[PDB]
């Protein structure tokens, strides 16, 4: 009837696919994984109707349809979700029919059918019917069809079976449309018209008569009885009920790790509830005996991070043989990350602890909760409880304020070249013997710390000057070079003047100032580092203005001098200097009178911007080569190796010898009207630095203006009175933008237009046209164009081009005409363009006189 | 919290012998 | 040796890492 | 036959010139110094009235120390021609230390420094010290032992180097046959001279110093009988017993013995009662006993010469801190080779330049009677930067008490320390883990090693295959022999690991165990020992090497040498700076450059131009109106993986003319590799060309045979530089312009205009513009625009005008822009009748 | 270490690993 | 055959033994 | 032994009355 | 008392004595 399977992990050897047979419920989840070619699947599994947990179909290839595998899938309950999803179908490049056609309920969580490049027909299902309604935010479908089609596939019945739905159709493929159940159904039934009884889930099947049975039934099942809840002594497990002892036969798989079923509260549960633990008879839950529950694990070698992971969530480490942290791989800084993951939860190493050959390991900080090493069977004939050998890079033991009581045996430390003896001597309060000291035989004094920065004193460094691009660092500490005077306040004394090579200054740009000193990892190269400077005054240089910098100092000495000192990291900031040029300055002509200038300060300010200074300078009017006449067209270490060699030679020598353009000064608000009071020749304004648009007014019609934009920052107190501001530099550089304003309408109208005959005796009538040159033109007049027309049809209007070089000296242009009444009108042409004519003037030209009447 | 290549070798570096631990 | 592989570039390296398959949960 | 020395020798003792300049009278008439010359702490040498041209040579060493007011050593030494170095100060023969006024060295006449080396240091004002070729003045192999530091440098010119003693004098070279013995850069001299020779006015020739010894000031290879050698010269016994050397803050008399004037009886002999002679030690061997103490220098190791027992509770501490240390082993031999046992511990700590304890040639026992360091240790060996082997081959050093301690000896491998196991009193199988640090020792030294040969099977352009042609055996299958290398356990050998990097100079040092020395790309292990590299850059020198990887239980190393190969040329990158500028209607100059890397040798460029069709005047433009996420992928993987433009076939010299033969439709030319410009000619006017420059590289035999299977190409990609040739002037001129009047009796005259459309305009004719001008004053030219197609098929147009003389002109407006106006046509239109007339 | 090449780089590496040649 | 490399281990990564298997 | 200023002083921590022993002229 | 070494010892001897500094053969 309802025979189950546990979880399944299907694999490319398709003989693994045969695991699905003769069980209708997967009692856990389905993974189908990396079948490189599923084509040899001759089988199908229509017996499979239900999965309790979730489906993953991941990178299956040689597979074309899920109907091929498990076509009768009717319910995925979601009694777990994978990351919130009950159905993941990911990157199945060959998957092309999502033929889950009988699928009715995904009772919890979301659906994610994506990257299946051949799976058309994904949005073509209204997944929201299949889910529970609360989950309808959790349907995700992407990359279903990068290049396969441009809407070329089609549903059943529709023209590019079922009615129209969502004003499209709902489609599993080109063949099948989404099964319904009535609105008062809820995906527990399997025809469009008449749902099953409401005790069912997914669907029901009706016998050859009319007896109706569930495919899956909702609240629980036992003996295939559709049930509200399991009877007393039957324990619920996701879908069916089980006997008490049967629960222990069950499993569920989590976090890549097995859990048994434990029968509690009338349920199988994979974990006892928080504050309870699995009983000793592995079949019942009990309270944590201490009120806290503590996973107990077995001691062994930890040769690799991939091994260290096995301890995750362990709290007690147990067994007759030492936990042995032996990360021989020079892995580097991630060693602490995986070790912290593996071991940070340990309370108690019963076995004693060994730390051997490990390269990457900086410290035992990763035992972030270790508080006892009970040493019930300590190493080397119970002699040592904590054995720390050959650890090249180990230089710290436990965390700050970390206590770890060691009950039995001593501690053995050798060949840890960076582990300072004075750090090992922090364990003295921690042994049960509370011993006064460690013997040479336990803690080798020459074997530990012979390259640690041990006994480091503290230097005080002060920023004695600053620039925009430089700084002076002075080491204020009385570092005494050569032996002291006894009363001296000598903080550190280098007993040999030449053992001290110099101070080394470290600095970096660090806006937050939360940086910390460089570790000994040469890949930790966050810091610029000076040559050693023996004066202790270093003028840092080429700094970025107004930038938060951090710096620190250490003394550098030959490898065999144990005196050393080192500052904390100190923070400072450079002066703001000169703010960068303003950007995007564009000038657009509005009219003959107005300009809109747009800009935005993209490059960074230094300090705080205080003003944008806008200045417009009127360029001279244009002028053009009238000799190139254009009536035709006016229109518009060795620090050790060589030093030590020097030391011992000089010692040997001495033993032998002695045997008994507008400078920003000018940036000020201005108005400079021209003499006519009509327009500006200069305009300037110190706009608020919040504004990046400016509108000019009363500009001279048709002229080019140069436009600055300048961003300025506040002056520093030392500048405004100690520099006397003479270095200035408060204000940016600028680029001269230009714009030409616009032509003033009708400004080129010739005024006072008059036309008359001269009275001198003539045969061809001397018509004189007079005017005054335009009083305020759009720039220099090229020519006047006079247009005149005899006032009848079939006449073209004549035009003459008269250079402006003629009209004043003529004081009136003279034209010859004969009998007729003529239109006259005139316009000037500027080098800006043709003007607009006057209204038409008229003249009656009288006829050539005659006397033969 | 998993043992697996997606933080063995994607979130940081790894040696190829770590990938070989997943093979059958 | 600088694997750094992620996503499909990791899948294509795990399948570069053995000719046989991988998955062996609860088996 | 034989030659005299130059001049005649007056000998002088081992002078010390101290504090007062009047002490320089000690050099007065000294020809040679029969020991060292020490000049020091003259706090102002400016009062120096004399230079001393007679000091031809010094037998031992020169020390100039803290002297000031002295501007050049030539002001003391005109002719210091050789330092013989029969003794050496710490191994140096010349020391010039902290002489604050010694701005010039001036030893122009110095021709040889015959042993040891030179240390010139802290002369903050000295200059040009850096220039002299000390390795050419020195002895043949001591080239490590010249040191030049803290000299100011004012911060033939043989083989382009300024070997000159400051401004005036340049240091002579000598030719190969007479290094350090030429009189000038031309003139070698007889081998019995050293430090050069003088040739007199006549051609008689005299050595400045004898290469061995002299008698009667005549150079000879050995003394006459009845006399004893004494560094520079032979002496009688009665001289030798009075002659002296100063050593160990002590004066020693000469002993005339065995042909030499020896300050110390040789091994197995001891001084006679009168000191005039040597006689055998009691039983033929002596038993000198010496106190243990810190050997800080070779000059202090001298103090042990002839010791044989080292005694007393202090540990004998070798702590020599020389660098490179060409002399360290020799002077340590002189010091302690005669030591046969050490009663205390031996300690060798913070040494530099000390290669090995092989100088303990006679050492047989470390009695350790009082040990050291909580009395735990007897042979204590810490922080030696150069120590890499202990005792001589088959030498034994029995240790009676305590252990060894070995730490931080980076170059001494544990296999070498383990040779001491058969020498401890306990004869243990191993050291205790407090007593030899497994990672501290030898981590930079070639440990238990055998060489791998590597053979490069094939070079490709982007790939190469390396095969480890040295064998490996795993276990003892069939009881192997001559395996070359063996791994005892099949688990232990993980495989060969292949290293490579781009290395143009082919000299990169091997990958260190520094965590961020990552110059080298490194493979994963490959048990077959064959690897195919990929993503190589072509024509690039790649260095590579191999090492065996084994689990940490296995000490068996094996590494190849560094070797190198160059990838094959592959394919050149695209040309650069290719821009085409029209010079004339038919001519384009084309620039280019090849600043990207060629991946081989470029043989020739190929430059081609393709004519393109003239533009089309679209119906859309009005002719006269518009005139011219991953987080889920990561999660899902974690859950699954449970751990357990046309191609070179078109490129050829090619030429193809228009159907009218007037212009090239295609032109292409192959050019010398130095040619980086070309001018096309006889191009069509105002017409677009595509242009490309494609470089081609030197074809290689295997590449052209390989190419037969996979059709590669030798030549770079296109980057077609589309642009147009210039406008041909005049071409758009309307021609055969005619205007006529039809006799149709209209009230205004139907003027007819006609012309020939242009022969070959600059592209398509868009419109014709007709212009007319009444030839009165008071008139201007007026313009009518007509679509081109409306005229062409009509071959005429009718304009209506009233009476007068009209000029007429026409021009085309092609897409190239307005053409020239025609020559001015005319019409003399006449008025219509008035019927009252 | 897994190889990856296509087109002429693939042919170049097949000509690399196959000094005794490969069928076209 | 270039067929076999373009079809397999160009859209995938070749092992060394895989690439060697295309040599004759 | 001990025959020089760098043994007597420096690592031998001489008194000034010893240091003058080299100057006595 | 005093622990001058190297240049410190050169400086103490050279400063803290007269023009007398004689040693060998005297």
Numbering used by the authors:
A (entry chain B): 335 to 494, 511 to 986, 1023 to 1046, 1118 to 1310
B (entry chain C), E (entry chain F), F (entry chain E): 1 to 24
C (entry chain D): 1 to 27
D (entry chain A): 328 to 482, 513 to 985, 1032 to 1047, 1118 to 1310
G (entry chain G): 1 to 25
H (entry chain H): 2 to 27
Give the article text:
The insulin-related hormones regulate key life processes in Metazoa, from metabolism to growth, lifespan and aging, through an evolutionarily conserved insulin signalling axis (IIS). The dmIR primary structure, with ~33% sequence identity in the overlapping regions, suggests that its domain organisation is similar to human IR-like receptors. dmIR domain topology, similar to hIR, is made of unique (αβ)2 subunit homodimers, with the same modular, exons-reflecting organisation. We selected the Drosophila DILP5 for dmIR-ECD studies as a typical representative and well-characterised fly ILP, having also a high homology to human insulin (~28% sequence identity), and with nM-range KD for the dmIR high-affinity site 1 of 0.76 (±0.16) nM21 that is within a range of human insulin:hIR interaction (e.g., 0.2–0.7 nM). Here, we provide the 3-D description of an invertebrate IR-like receptor by determining the cryoEM structure of the dmIR-ECD in the complex with DILP5.
The 5:1 molar hormone:receptor ratio used for the preparation of the dmIR-ECD complex resulted in an asymmetric three-DILP5:dmIR-ECD arrangement. There are two adjacent insulins bound to sites 1 and 2’ on the down-arm/dynamic and static protomers, respectively, and one insulin at site 1’ on the arm-up/static protomer. The overall DILP5’s binding modes in site 1 (down-arm (Λ) and up-arm site 1’ (Γ)) follows closely engagements of human insulins in respective h(m)IR sites. However, the third DILP5 molecule binds to site 2’ on the FnIII-1’ domain of the static protomer being adjacent to - and in contacts with - the down-arm site 1-bound DILP5, while site 2 is unoccupied. However, DILP5 sits ~6 Å lower on the FnIII-1’ side-surface than insulin in hIR’s sites 2/2’, with its B-helix also closer by ~2.7 Å to the FnIII-1’, especially when compared at the Cα atoms of ValB16(LeuB17) (in brackets: corresponding sequences of hIR (or human insulin)). This lowering of site 2’ DILP5 is likely required for the simultaneous accommodation of both DILP5s in sites 1 and 2’ in the lower-arm environment. Here, the shorter Lys884-Gly886 FnIII-1 loop minimises the steric hindrance upon binding of both DILP5s into the lower arm site1/2’ space, while the longer – dmIR specific - Ala1168-Ser1189 loop (with central short Ile1173-Thr1181 helix) provides a supporting ledge for the site 2’-bound hormone. In the dmIR-ECD this loop is slightly longer, and—importantly—it is reconfigured into a narrow β-hairpin that points directly into the DILP5 binding cavity that would be occupied by the C-domain of single-chain insulin-like family of hormones. Another characteristic structural feature of the dmIR-ECD is the reshaped - and slightly longer than in the hIR - Ala594-615Asn (Cys259-280His) CR-domain loop, which may prevent binding of any insulin-like hormone with a significant C-domain (e.g., hIGF-1-like).
